[PDB]
Ligand SMILES: Cc1ncc(COP(=O)(O)O)c(/C=N/[C@@H](Cc2c[nH]c3ccccc23)C(=O)O)c1O
Ligand SMILES: N[C@@H](Cc1c[nH]c2ccccc12)C(=O)O
Ligand SMILES: N[C@@H](Cc1c[nH]c2ccccc12)C(=O)O
């Protein structure tokens with residue numbers, strides 16, 4: 001339910017029943033061998049797990065500091081880590097007798113992942129997507145359509161992630177007996193932050209085994225970008241009890257933290273309640289939720305997962321921010337230097353990893369979670385550069 | 386050099402020296418442990434091999450006949466099988482002491498794969514692309530630019546793939562001292578058809594081990610789309626000596642075989658010499674090569690690799706054609722039924738497998754080479 005004080009289940013009474021049924025189903029199936037057999041089967045043969053752990057030798061030498069390994073979630077079917085959670089929840093939803101999936105999306109990767117999982121399992125998919133994100137992630141909009149999903153543009157508010165989430169939640173309140181709300185990050189009311197983290201923990205379980213094979217030791221640092229926090233939690237979680245391993249989450253610095261146009265909730269937000277959870281949120285002078293910004297639409301959310309709020313409080317993980325321009329430079333850099341076009345979200349992690357490697361010893365090891373590929377971002381990057 | 390009567394080195398004298406040097410370097414490195422270790426290392430950690438073999442159960446049960454498996458080359462880094470050949474040749478070029486890679490591209494996927502490989506190994510990359518194709522393929526050209534490759538338009542001839550190869554070959558005559566011409570399919574003068582096939586054969590070696598793991602037996606049929614023929618040779622080659630395994634190559638039928646707007650060289654073309662090889666080409670009465678067409682830009686080539694001409698001749702493989710419309714149907718079908726958006730090229734193979742599966746029994750097995758993903762084709766399918 002809680003991570004320290006953070007998390008919880010602060011929802012209208014209409015959603016208590018559906019959430020409790022989800023809790024019970026998850027508790028029954030999370031360690032069920034047959035459930036995990038089907039999940040592992042799809043992750044392997046359909047999604048293409050395990051993903052490799054790649055040594056960025058050109059990038060490492062160029063920077064001249066620590067070794068930079070990339071965990072290659074960009075290679076997962078769909079082009080991001082989102083699929084790990086999408087298939088897991090869709091399978092659970094099907095076991096619970098649901099015939100419809102709904103989901104918010106910003107980058108469109110979760111929308112696409114959800115549409116793919118829905119296609120695979122013969123479930124109807126409606127995706128809620130901010131009107132601004134419909135325009136700047138158009139590639140993923142047409143993928144969703146071709147996969148047989150309906151894309152619902154959301155015109156209210158900031159026309160982005162938070163607004164998509166409000167609309168999805170309103171849908172779910174009405175449609176829950178046959179609709180599973182397939183939330184795409186470690187956010188929302190319990191049990192979602194736990195479920196999404198658990199389904200993403202495969203990233204870190206693989207990476208741990210892979211870095212032990214490559215280097216015979218655990219990494220000194222793990223760097224991951226933080227929108228809602230799922231790819232970060234996925235790669236972090238298996239290392240949390242390893243005392244050697246520093247954990248760094250990288251939030252969207254936007255136009256700068258003083259610009260009022262960023263998504264760094266942990267760095268510059270206040271504790272508060274929204275979307276069923278106590279966590280960090282960007283707030284205005286009256287204490288209301290204020291709109292966020294990032295060039296990477298997957299990071300463009302005023303909130304953050306409560307497990308990260310907890311990791312920040314106990315100082316198990318450090319949270320930093322990287323600006324739009326810094327992220328753009330890393331996007332170009334990785335493409336030219338390693339021949340990998342990353343997602344703009346992932347480019348934030350690369351950007352900070354390049355800063356951090358520079359300051360570190362050649363003996364030391366950084367693992368960056370390369371959460372996605374950048375095909376979706378080509379229009380954005382074309383306009384910006 | 387030859388596959389039956391097909392193949393050869395039909396080039397000017399200026400290219401004979403470079404090809405002998407390429408052949409010598411390849412014979413040296415092909416079976417060498419160090420070359421193969423480094424190649425396998427990149428294929429594993431950078432490209433993400435092995436790719437899975439996926440049982441398309443929903444598609445299978447919908448059609449109601451044979452089991453349809455998909456060899457998932459769509460999951461290779463870059464989104465297509467081309468990467469396998471790009472890494473192999475780029476690495477070969479690098480050990481040969483070359484500092485520059487050139488390549489043709491039409492669809493843009495090989496250009497992107499060549500650009501990626503050059504970025505990986507720290508070599509300059511110029512991609513030759515016919516002017517009509519530069520215009521047709523905005524985003525692939527942009528991908529190449531982002532990877533640090535220069536894209537050179539070719540306004541010679543019909544301003545397309547055949548002309549890019551000619552312009553690429555013209556470049557290589559002058560620059561072979563420091564440049565490797567990284568050819569994108571099983572075409573061109575020897576040793577290119579053999580080299581590209583060898584670097585793609587991993588697809589088939591994986592598929593064979595994976596189908597034995599999944600089903601305890603070899604497939605009844607393997608279906609692959611054929612542009613120049615590299616993904617098909619890659620999956621076919623390790624099965625060629627398993628005589629029970631039926632091999633079907635699917636060419637672009639376009640607007641129809643009788644419309645004269647297709648790229649089915651094996652089906653409707655005639656024997657010819659072009660681009661350094663003797664093989665099948667769509668051509669006019671003077672032996673001049675005819676324009677080709679396909680909705681799938683990777684199949685839009687008037688020729689085909691000589692090893693396919695050979696397999697057709699000795700009847701080891703059957704070659705069929707699927708139309709633009711049929712390929713579009715399969716594209717939508719696979720997306721909606723399995724949640725995999727295939728490349729339009731690969732959709733030709735899926736389309737034929739769907740027809741073939743209906744006439745076969747459930748205890749029989751079809752492997753389709755899903756040569757790529759459809760992210761590159763979204764505008765084409767939206768505009769169709
Ligand atoms: C490639 C890639 N990397 C990183 C992220 C950051 O998300 P996380 O921190 O969870 O790893 C995203 C988010 N993509 C989502 C954005 C999103 C969906 N649901 C959310 C809830 C809260 C915050 C963000 C999102 C998408 O719509 O595709 C992504 O697509
Ligand atoms: N503070 C909640 C209030 C709310 C309205 N409708 C909801 C539905 C589900 C959960 C919370 C709500 C929010 O994020 O808007
Ligand atoms: N035209 C496709 C495939 C291709 C590359 N080189 C070829 C040579 C012959 C036939 C097809 C090809 C591309 O550029 O990606």
Ligand code: NA
Pocket residue numbers: 226227228251263264265266299300301302303304
């Ligand atoms: Na945030």
Ligand code: NA
Pocket residue numbers: 611612613636648649650651684685686687688689
């Ligand atoms: Na052809």
